[PDB]
Write a protein that binds this ligand. Structure first.
Ligand SMILES: [Ca+2]
Ligand SMILES: [Ca+2]
Length: 686
């Protein structure tokens, strides 16, 4: 089926996501509304339920509000049953309207609808070529106090109505009992509770298996994507076995949220996007777009440097979800902000690399500060705002122009207030010119592009004051004046003759799993897929057409491989790197080592004989391990995704700078479980 099909659950670069807080969008069925203290139909107390549900989203797909805009994916609130308590936090009452306080991950939140309403949403969205992404928040259940069993629902977890346990008198240790995080370290933020939310213990086998069974159920109901909440607050090792469960079962696009503040660049963030199996909400893009287009705290050179730098730092930049605001940020549009600023930032996001996500109500110019003021009910479903027309004209180019869905980003002209960039994929081109200065015209001279000669009409139709571009010989544009606030988009599409790979999903899975390779120029006849130097042909290629190949991963050893495609004529594509073949199914094992004293700056790591442990290479060892919360120095510990049902060999080592000190003695051995978790508790061998 083509890369642009609604059935492509693995890659979303050709999509535009609309992020919906279910409760704040449309109340299509008032009979399922919470009653009493939990409900506010006027939606003026924004911490209560206002009544929005899945029938409301179905109505807005059916009547053309969402499809008229060109939206091809909706991101909705976590669908699972939440606690029913109205919690009074210092006078103000609070409900689970946001979906984040789960009590049963196998049932629906009845305020949103029944299981049949969820199914009708999937089917209605798919029948209108809209993919459905759900939030999933496996880090916690709900607010709880072990000291006060009567507070809220005591964080209790049910499995399809059967109570597994609560936070008070947690004899099975389903939860962590280490106190609340102060966010001082990543370790601290993982094993301690976020605020008062009962922290799930993923090293408990019942919890591990339950959460994995639960995500499979939602995959079985037809969801096309998962946004995982709080990825910075769960063990990386556990989340990698969780991604392995999804990808080895029914791979769908998965991305997490790891917040970054203005000008913050975090190596751990980029390492998570590059090695976890899921991509991220691109905060780096979002914060810089807001500094240049909203707050005027940086100029176009800052924008250029983020675009150029992120192309390198993210191994798969076409998988990052971009946005200009969302549920954790003040709305982009302010009371005294010019509406053109929002209109340009939306144009920039819709034509840039990644997967664009538009927060509900952007097209209606909603203003609002932080939580909960950025979650007001949508005021209007007017389909004629300039913001609605901008998304309506640009969001289709993601399906029609592969340079926008997949291409490289190249700055063609710039100064403090103007950027003209080009997106290029094969011979498909899109060129975007943005003047953020609302008062001054920009004289453009010397612009050169990859456009064939012609008179290109602005895809926006002049609504943001764009103009026609005349391109002469050799891609040289005739000189022009870009209007104050001007934004224009010019494009050219044609066939690719050469194979070009634009995206691959999933990027981590065991031998036997079918992966999806999207791009252009693959041709109609079945050709060859290379995993490193291993060629895959014939029956292992499940489908081949010009924009998409589906192929089974060969039985090669675990490790990182480059993907390359050769069409039937033997012409080969660009290399798509960093694909991880797993040794097999994954389980998370906690490795604990005692008596490992270290010097300043010296940490303990783990390595062993499978790719998941770095195949004995100190530079790819797992760690640095932890030593403060669950166990304390000189005991170190870490949760690691390792192949299931196998005897692995390993050794611990200390690293400080370039110096590696290996444990002495024989290599350690351990036979991993087939499912669930296990703990290895050992003593440093001198
Ligand atoms: Ca309702
Ligand atoms: Ca946690």
């Amino acid at each position: 089926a083509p890369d642009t099909s609604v059935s492509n659950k693995q890659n979303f670069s050709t999509d535009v996501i609309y992020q919906i807080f279910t409760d704040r969008f449309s109340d299509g069925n008032p009979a399922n509304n919470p009653t009493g203290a939990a409900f506010d139909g006027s939606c003026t107390n924004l911490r209560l339920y206002c009544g929005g549900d899945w029938q409301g989203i179905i109505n807005k797909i059916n009547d053309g509000y969402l499809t008229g805009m060109g939206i091809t994916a909706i991101w909705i609130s976590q669908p699972v049953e939440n606690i029913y308590s109205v919690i009074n936090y210092s006078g103000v009452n609070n409900t689970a309207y946001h979906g984040y306080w789960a009590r049963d991950f196998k049932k629906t939140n009845p305020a949103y609808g029944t299981m049949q309403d969820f199914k009708n949403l999937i089917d209605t969205a798919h029948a209108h070529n809209i993919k459905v992404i759900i939030d999933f928040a496996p880090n916690h259940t709900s607010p709880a106090s072990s000291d006060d069993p009567s507070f809220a629902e005591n964080g209790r977890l049910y499995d399809n109505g059967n109570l597994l346990g609560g936070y008070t008198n947690d004899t099975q240790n389903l939860f962590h009992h280490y106190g609340g995080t102060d966010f001082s370290t990543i370790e601290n933020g993982i094993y301690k509770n976020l605020y008062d939310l009962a922290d799930l213990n993923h090293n408990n086998s019942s919890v591990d298996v339950y959460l994995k069974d639960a995500i499979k159920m939602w995959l079985d109901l037809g969801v096309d994507g998962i946004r995982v909440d709080a990825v910075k607050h769960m063990p990386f090792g556990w989340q990698k076995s969780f991604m392995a469960t999804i990808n080895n079962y029914k791979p769908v696009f998965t991305f997490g949220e790891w917040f970054l503040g203005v000008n913050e660049i975090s190596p751990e963030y980029h390492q998570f996007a590059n090695e976890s199996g899921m991509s991220l909400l691109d905060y780096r893009f979002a914060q810089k777009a807001r500094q240049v287009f909203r707050d005027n705290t940086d100029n176009m050179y800052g924008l250029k440097a983020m675009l150029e730098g992120s192309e390198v730092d993210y191994a798969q930049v076409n998988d990052q979800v971009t946005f200009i605001d969302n549920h954790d940020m003040e709305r982009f549009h302010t009371s005294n902000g010019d509406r053109r600023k929002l209109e340009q930032a939306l144009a920039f996001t819709l034509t840039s690399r990644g997967v664009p996500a538009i927060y509900y109500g952007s097209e209606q110019y909603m203003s609002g500060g932080n939580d909960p003021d950025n979650r007001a009910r949508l005021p209007s479903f007017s389909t004629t705002t300039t913001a609605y027309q901008v998304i309506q004209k640009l969001a289709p180019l993601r399906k029609s122009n592969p340079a926008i869905a997949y291409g490289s980003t190249h700055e063609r002209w710039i100064n403090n207030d103007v950027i003209i960039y080009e997106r290029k994929f094969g011979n498909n081109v899109a060129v975007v010119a943005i003047n953020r200065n609302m008062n001054t015209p920009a004289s453009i001279t010397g612009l050169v592009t990859s456009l064939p000669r012609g008179s290109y009409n602005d895809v926006l139709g002049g609504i943001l004051n764009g103009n026609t571009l005349t391109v002469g010989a050799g891609g040289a544009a005739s000189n022009f004046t870009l209007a104050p606030g001007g934004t224009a988009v010019w494009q050219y599409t044609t066939d690719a003759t050469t194979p070009i790979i634009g995206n691959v999903g999933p990027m981590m899975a065991k031998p036997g799993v079918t992966i999806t390779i999207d791009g252009r120029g693959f041709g109609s006849g079945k050709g060859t897929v290379y995993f490193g130097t291993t060629a895959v042909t014939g029956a292992d290629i499940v489908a081949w057409e010009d924009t998409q190949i589906q192929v089974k991963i060969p039985a090669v050893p675990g490790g990182i491989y480059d993907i390359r495609v050769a069409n039937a004529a033997g012409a080969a594509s660009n290399i798509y790197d960093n694909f991880e073949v797993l040794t097999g199914d994954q389980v998370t094992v906690r490795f604990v080592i005692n008596n490992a004293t270290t010097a300043l700056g010296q940490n303990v790591f783990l390595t062993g004989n499978v790719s998941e442990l770095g195949n004995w290479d100190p530079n790819n060892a797992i760690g640095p391990m932890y030593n403060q919360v669950v166990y304390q120095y000189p005991t170190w510990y870490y949760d690691v995704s390792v192949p299931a049902g196998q005897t692995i060999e390993f050794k611990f080592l200390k690293k400080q700078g370039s110096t590696v000190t290996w444990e002495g003695g024989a290599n350690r051995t351990f036979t991993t479980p087939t499912s669930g978790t296990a703990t290895v508790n050992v003593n440093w061998q001198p």
